[PDB]
Design a protein around this motif. Structure first.
Motif: not given
Ligand code: FE
Ligand code: ZN
Ligand code: ZN
Lengths: 249, 450, 142, 249
Positions: B188, B190, B232, B390, B407
């Motif tokens: 995660d 991003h 992600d 997360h 995350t």
């Molecule tokens: Fe994420």
DNA sequence: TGTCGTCAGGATTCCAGGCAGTTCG
DNA sequence: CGAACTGCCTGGAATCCTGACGACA
């Protein structure tokens, strides 16, 4: 059992393929050393087809052991749909239950189709009294069954000593096909005593659909007897039909 | 907007790298397993314009029944396994039946279940005050494979005992390795949004070279030879219309190239593991073989960058490492009561005892039908990886190591509108030999306070 | 206006293309219709509504049951794969008719998703394929 | 921009428009002083069309300034649908962007159609050796493709030194089309090394539907190389097609 | 209840069948 | 002088095109 079959003029045989597959979708070939026959029955039990092909029809014809093979003509129609006349069709079988179709001539195209069992009712051809024999043509049959279809759904066969007429009428429209010796529709006739019978139209329209126009057809029937439609192929082979009479008219 | 192609820092010379043999062998490869001669050849006998959906999704449950049925057969506890259609012969004897869970019906008399197998369907009634009522009630209601011991009745199977695809508690331990090695689990990230924790990320990249703050981190980092990314990597495209004003990098090639320049700082002796996701420019349907061939050109150029499948079982030193992301946690905390995002591991226990990743359909992720169910955990997993919540938590279930990955972005308004508090800058340092959590790295000081 | 207003958008948009002098900037006019197609294909994709032939108002659960227990008919599913494939070439030909960025991922991600879901290596990118042509530019530049 | 060209015959060019319309949907014939050419690809990425028609095919050929116009395949296909080859095809374009198609046959038919602004990107084709160039007729390709496309969807092309064969397999129906130089359907062989590749016959069906019976067809392809098939028109024109090979099973 | 899939009738082309123009047995 | 060679007109078989009927959410 492995065998080799060679037949010339696949174009003429395609009419037999369309005629044979038009009624029943599958065929059971009786492969015999003396020739290849075929007895297939319609599921509605209306017609029995029997193809008789001697050895003298095939130029190259090698038989190891006679047996019965199953041919799915639904795809064999597609095999001989584009076959020519000046070419040579070849049907060979090896050890496995496969059929290899060697197509030689201007181009080499071999096929490989599985051989599956064909379920057909065991119905032979008993020695029945056929007192009405007439020789017709393809166009006479086409125009007769189609024109008889536009007026009704059944047909009445009336054959006398020197005439063969077909009268059929549903409610208003009447058809009566007369055959004499002055025209070319009727060449030979063998009718001893007056004979009448009744048969369908849709089935005859499905059988004449594969047969051409310049093909002489031998027709036989007797007093309320099954119909025997047979004709020779290259003057040696013989295709025989069996139709069931109809109680109606 | 930047492109992240300037952060190039050489590793510290003072940090000692340990040169040792690094085994590497993946177990679950989608190329040689499914798409070899099973995915391109499903039916091949249909019309001019046919579908390959009825057979893939049809056999998708049959493969699960064979695999999980084999798992039940391997367990020397379940016995008298019969089909639902064979219950009419048994008069009163108790038997075991294995089938799918269509729905769950609650009644004052008890629990009425609708179990359908490839042979038949029957209603499995169980009492309320039963020992197995809790496992059968808290189980995954839309899709689950269960077994029951009981006797049928007048049309309703009165079951007595329940059986779920739980991991065996009795398992053979792993031999101790001669050399110590550790691993990092993260996902995660991003990259592409305007709220990315870029500071914790670059301090994390600088921390990976050997720039540690405490003396204890040198012993662990000096032996880390594997890095795994769950998924992600970007914020996504096409989720909500207010994303264009949030995506700092609207160009996808700059996100792949930017991510390639951010990941190239990892030394070559550390094995890289890159798994695809659902927000990136790749196959958004699970399972995911890998990246595309247009946007992942610099990643394919990097030989050190290994694009693993999703999911993928990475066996290292004889250890099965199940690498996946999924969405089953949200289905559990949103479908099973007493579960929340603050305790995602508790939601992960249910997914662990089912040997599946995401059986719940209807969530915000497309599922591609395949003739063979690959998401079934056949072998005993040593590690179970998940995320998408997360929140990092550590929990061991029947000797199985359960942890989250956290995350790397701050809390957004979207995360704020759904009442979920993310936990960024969470770096769990796990051990590969002991298959347990060794240390926890928190860089929350550089990130926003939760 | 799927007939007059749609053609009106196809002509006025081309007039705007002639007005901007082949300088296209990212916009949301047709994308205003492409987003429901994306969320509809992805949404109904994981739904797979089973409806038998006899029963229509009787929907079956998303898990597979083999056949409909109520009626002796095959179950028909709606994964939204064959109904949306008609509106895709409408704007796909217009998007394919120009090389623009920040939108190639949305255009090619859905069709490549349909390819990965269903499953002709093209000799080259002559159908206006910004995939090979573009990546080749970046690779040759590196 | 204004130009006029008079080509005799309408049906011979209608075969080109028929083949192009069945292989491409949107094309813009570019007009050069050497002749009419068109290098485009089908918008579904199935085939690649390259039409090369010199001025020697055209009876009258009058150019002022070379330019490019767009022609719809459907409309122009319907024009030459019933157009007799005994007419006189006349293409005229003046100051305005209209196309005048005058027919001087049994009835003078002066036609007018607008010419849309096609944005066709002029793309060329690179050059590389294929090592497999065959010269075969057109009719043999017709019967060889139309019969194997019903049993399978992919066909395998293999060419050896003085050997040619095109075998296609399937579930339970195999086929092969083997030709050599001493046959009557294969004209010439320029095969140097062993060549084998797989292609889709479904593209070859519509790709060969517009071919003739006596037209010499030249094929150039390789092992991993794309498929190339070119043939001449009135011994001078050349029509080349190139399709990407199948990367699937 | 509109729309998609499929079947039969009509139109088309090459080949067989049939018909002009010329020369040597 | 009259049929074969050559070339050409027309019907028949194979092919292609189009209108009408039955089914699904
Ligand atoms: Fe994420
Ligand atoms: Zn996630
Ligand atoms: Zn039903």
């Amino acid at each position: 059992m492995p065998f080799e079959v060679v037949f010339d003029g696949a174009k003429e045989f395609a009419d037999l393929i369309a005629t044979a597959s038009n009624l029943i979708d599958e065929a059971a070939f009786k492969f015999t050393e003396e020739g290849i026959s075929m007895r297939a029955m319609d599921p509605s039990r209306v017609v029995l087809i029997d193809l008789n092909l001697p050895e003298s029809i095939f130029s190259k014809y090698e038989v190891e052991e006679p047996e019965t093979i199953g041919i799915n003509m639904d795809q064999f129609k597609k095999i001989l749909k584009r076959g020519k006349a000046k070419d040579t069709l070849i049907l060979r079988k090896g050890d496995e239950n496969f059929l290899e179709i060697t197509f030689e001539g201007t181009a080499k195209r071999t096929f490989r189709l599985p051989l599956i069992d064909v379920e057909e009712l065991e119905l032979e051809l008993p020695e029945l009294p056929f007192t009405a024999k007439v020789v017709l043509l393809g166009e006479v049959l086409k125009e007769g069954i189609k024109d008889a279809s536009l007026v009704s759904d059944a047909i009445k066969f009336i054959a006398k000593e020197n005439e063969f007429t077909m009268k059929a009428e549903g409610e208003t429209n009447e058809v009566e096909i007369r055959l004499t010796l002055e025209d070319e529709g009727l060449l030979d006739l063998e009718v001893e005593e007056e004979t009448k019978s009744a048969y369908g139209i849709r089935y005859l329209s499905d059988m004449v659909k594969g047969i051409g126009k310049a093909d002489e057809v031998i027709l036989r029937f007797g007093n309320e007897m099954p119909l025997q439609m047979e004709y020779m192929i290259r003057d040696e082979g013989r295709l025989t039909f069996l139709l069931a009479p109809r109680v109606e008219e | 907007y930047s492109t992240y192609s300037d952060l190039v820092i050489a590793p510290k010379e003072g940090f000692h790298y340990r040169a040792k043999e690094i085994p590497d062998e993946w177990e679950l490869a989608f190329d040689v397993k499914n798409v070899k001669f099973e995915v391109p050849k499903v039916k091949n006998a249909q019309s001019k314009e046919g579908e390959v959906i009825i057979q893939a999704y049809s056999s998708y449950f049959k493969s699960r029944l064979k695999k999980m049925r084999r798992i039940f057969r391997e367990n020397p506890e379940i016995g008298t396994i019969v089909d639902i259609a064979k219950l009419s012969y048994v008069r009163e004897d108790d038997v075991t039946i294995i089938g799918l869970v269509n729905e769950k019906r609650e009644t004052r008399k008890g629990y009425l279940f609708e179990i359908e197998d490839a042979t038949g369907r029957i209603k499995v009634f169980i009492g309320s005050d039963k020992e197995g009522a809790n496992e059968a009630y808290s189980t995954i209601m839309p899709d689950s494979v269960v077994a029951f011991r009981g006797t049928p009745g007048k049309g309703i199977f009165f079951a007595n005992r329940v059986f779920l695809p739980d991991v065996p508690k009795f398992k053979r331990s792993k031999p101790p390795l001669e050399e110590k090695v550790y691993a990092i689990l993260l996902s995660d990230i991003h990259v592409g949004s305007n709220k990315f924790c870029e500071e914790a990320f670059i301090k994390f990249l600088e921390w990976l070279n050997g720039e540690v703050n405490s003396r204890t981190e040198e012993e662990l980092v000096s032996r880390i030879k594997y890095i795994i990314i769950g998924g992600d990597v970007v914020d996504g495209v096409g989720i909500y219309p207010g994303q264009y004003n949030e995506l700092a990098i609207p160009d996808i090639f700059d996100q792949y190239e930017a991510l390639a320049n951010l990941l190239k700082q990892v030394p070559d002796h550390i094995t890289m593991f890159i798994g695809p996701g659902n927000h990136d420019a790749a196959r958004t349907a699970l399972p995911q073989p890998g990246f595309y061939e247009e946007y992942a050109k610099p990643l394919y150029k990097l030989k050190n960058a290994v694009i693993i499948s999703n999911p993928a079982v990475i066996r290292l030193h004889g250890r099965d490492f199940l690498v996946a992301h999924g969405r089953g946690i949200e289905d559990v905390v949103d479908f099973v009561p007493n579960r929340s995002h603050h305790r995602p591991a508790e939601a992960m226990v249910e997914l662990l005892k089912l040997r599946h990743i995401a059986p719940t359909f209807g969530n915000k992720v497309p599922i591609a039908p395949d003739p063979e169910d690959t998401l079934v955990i056949e072998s005993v997993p040593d590690l179970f990886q998940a995320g998408h919540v997360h929140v990092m938590q550590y929990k061991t279930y029947n000797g199985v190591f359960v942890i989250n990955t956290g995350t790397w972005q701050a809390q957004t308004e979207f995360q704020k509108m759904v009442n979920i508090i993310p936990t960024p800058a969470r770096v769990p340092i796990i051990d590969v030999e002991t298959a347990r959590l060794r240390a926890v790295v928190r860089f929350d000081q550089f990130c926003e306070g939760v | 206006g799927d007939m007059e207003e749609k053609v009106a958008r196809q002509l006025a948009l081309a007039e705007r293309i002639r007005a901007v002098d082949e300088h296209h900037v990212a916009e949301t006019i047709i994308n205003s219709h492409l987003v429901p197609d994306l969320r509809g294909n992805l949404r109904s994709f994981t739904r797979q509504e089973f409806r038998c032939v006899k029963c229509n108002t009787k929907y079956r659960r998303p898990p597979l049951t083999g056949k409909c227990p109520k009626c002796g008919g095959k179950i028909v599913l709606t994964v939204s794969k064959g109904a949306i494939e008609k509106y895709l070439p409408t704007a796909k030909m217009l998007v394919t008719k120009y090389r623009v960025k920040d939108y190639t991922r949305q255009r090619i991600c859905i069709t490549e998703k349909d390819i990965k879901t269903l499953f002709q290596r093209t000799l080259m990118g002559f159908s206006a394929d910004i995939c090979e042509k573009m990546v080749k530019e970046r690779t040759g530049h590196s």
